[PDB]
Amino acid sequence: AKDAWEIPRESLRLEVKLGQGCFGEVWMGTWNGTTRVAIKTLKPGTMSPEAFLQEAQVMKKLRHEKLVQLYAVVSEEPIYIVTEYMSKGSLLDFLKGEMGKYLRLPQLVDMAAQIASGMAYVERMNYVHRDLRAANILVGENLVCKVADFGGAKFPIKWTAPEAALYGRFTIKSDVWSFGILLTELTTKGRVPYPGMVNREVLDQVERGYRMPCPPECPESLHDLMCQCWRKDPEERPTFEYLQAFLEDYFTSTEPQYQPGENL
Template sequence: EQNDGLCQKLTESCANQKPQQPWEKDAWEISRDTLKLDRRLGAGQFGEVWMATYNKHTKVAVKTMKPGTMSLEAFMAEANLMKTLQHDKLVKLHAVVTKEEPIYIITEFMEKGSLLDFLKTPEGNRVQLPKLIDFSAQTAEDGAYIYTHTHTHRGLMCLYLICTCLYCSLSSVVPSSVIFNTNHWVLTGAKFPIKWTAPEAINYGSFTIKSDMWSFGILLMEIVTYGRTPYPGMSNPDVIRALERDYRMPRTESCPEELYDIMLKCWKKKPEDRPTFEYMQSVLEDFYTATESQYQQQP
């Protein structure tokens, strides 16, 4: 109504102003018609992930549920849990499509895709050890945050990590109960990755913060080997039998002994002997500082 120091009195709002997104209004449900699936980014045991465009202008990631792999209740439990978890290193949930199948979970889009894929690229292969340890420390920080909210992640696999601008974020939190199948563990109908699973979870279905710490140790090996699949050359039954004999993945040439010792702490036979995520974050941050200074001193 008054210039109040402006050169000209304001008239009307800008016609090209970006429209408000539904997730900015805390309205999670959106119409499927507002999404255009552009390119499939990958597929896992639970479903597919697509790069998509929302309302013709916003790039997002869309996670779809693969029919027959997870119950609708479990899939929606993941979305509901993501609504409650807000952290700068956790991928943010934007919206859901739940009125009819296929169900969609819409999250922020991460430019470099999964950490597993990134580490296998020429760019990822040039990442030096200090940054790999930094990835690991950030993941431990994510784990510590999740456990302050009393949730287990049950999927600390490199495949479920996202990397953008050399910055890591956990991409999904998989809740729900576990039942046994003759070939694999099942999360209310979803296949569970044996090679990342702690022995007590394989044998007794005991998923705790300590079983996730075992998975974190597997993840450390994945990161330091630039995305190599754990237990190379071994099938799931081979891994189960080996773990019964207290077998542990051996150290690779690319893995410093100090980092391997950290992995072995994660793989202690007794769950109560494994460290906490807060401890791992502290140890890895110190290790990162030490290795970074060593690399900076090299000619």
Template sequence: MEGMDKEPWFFKDLSRLDAIRMLLAPGNTKGSFLIRESESNKGSYTLSVRDLDNNAGDTVKHYKIRNMDKGGFYITARIAFNSLSELVKHYSREADGLCTTLIKPCQTRIPQKPWWQDEWEIPRESLKLERRLGGGAVWRGIYNNHTKVAIKNLKVGTMSTSAFLAEANLMKNLQHPRLVRLYAVVTQEPIYIVTEFMANGSLVDFLKTNERRQHDHKHPHRHGISGKAQTLWLREWRLLKRGITSTGTCGRPTSWCLRTSSARSPTSASLASSRTTSTRREKVLNSPIKWTAPEAINYGTFSIKSDVWSFGILLTETVTYGRIPYPGMTNPEVIQNLERGYRMPRPDDCPEELYSIMNLCWQEAPEKRPTFEYLRSVLEDFFTAQKQQYQTQPC
């Protein structure tokens, strides 16, 4: 449309995913918005608006802008507008059915080069490190004097600069309400990755709290809710990052998110270089053995099927309030027992149906383990059945 390219809120060729990423980036708040061309219906438009949900946190809502036969636009048939500018002016005055009024156009930065120094780059001076979280390289900090953030810095000797920046680049493409959100990066030494601050810490910390137990008493159908959240994430992104232990998974006050945690995870490259079983065992003993599939322990073979195994282990943590898998066993004992075909017994209060799903994940032969798409389907069926059963119980 002639003249529309000059409007600060008009992003013609922006994809839905990029719209989410940009609206959730620093500089935007509830009510930030943009209008883009529809991906599914060329010639039509979509209004994308940042909102703040009490349960999910910051989210982005999308509204179809429909074309009228004789010209003009509308979101709801109750009211039509001659132009997109009129539409924006109206919803800037009142929400009128939208999630919020339109406050300001989406803010973005001019891209820089090289590839990692893009709109995510921020000056180091905008960050203040307050307190180290745990014993690692992550700090609680403040961004721009008001936003609480988590700041991960590259510790010397832990991983290469390129791998650290690759992790940040991966997170740029993972903007979702159930995921820890990347806010920014500092690519000059010392390198920082700046992410959303999770008040409840890691998932395992939250699982051990009274709040989690009270949550389960109020919502008994939500066994394994974090697993459900992660299957939704898998469906959305078709991507799995190694290291899905509950210590690498963070808890929002009322929801869940998966955090990339490459520093905890063994890589096939580091293990495949082992020439003997003994050398290989020495290397993997320093890895999260209790979450690792047998073929990855023994041969350094990591695949989507070894991730399925790890996912099954994670499910046990969600129903045992963060109990470490294989309680009472050392890592060498776990390895020996797995070689004999041992599997963890069903945890107390774990439904038989959910335990059956865990055992599917722990098939000895990787090819016999289910796909994540299958797991998503059966878990959603399980949660639906649990919810219906709970709702039909007498009060």
């Protein structure tokens, strides 16, 4: 006796290795021979089985067309987590790669709108992401983007709100700060934010009120949105609901005069 999420081990086929960790592996493959899936492995005796199925428990109560969807679990060791497959890989890779170069503002704002949509769901459900950035966004056909999480210790300090990096105060509002940084990533073809700066200068500078400038060819109105996401006070930051609707309507309500340029 166990979950309706459980599947028989023969229904899974692991076709292509998408990468490795110290806790296991991730593969693209097939489920019931018909459906393309992403499959995550737990190397047994390298981390708690309970600690691995934590994610799966969380992903069970999560269901949105812009969050990576859990498909199934093999909940006894060797454990397996199975999700939908996103054919185009990370937004980060997609932005810097050969696709990057044809993306203009209308595709990029649309992508931001989807991510804001997935995040407004996270907001509605009172969850926190904690590592929102282009490396945790997945791209599918048709420029579908979805919010993922691939997993102190380390720090993506550059994407992380000050009250979070410094005192561990992670909220939906610290995700909003990150979303602002993700907007720069989307407008610079995936360049690392705060160019030339290192972690300590970023922390020193942002604390004194430095904010990245408007990217080249990015409308000021979009840079203003970023700046609202970067307000010193976490509660001055807007909601993802606001963000989602601002970006959906962008080319009618905010930049109706927009003309394509060289990069954006």
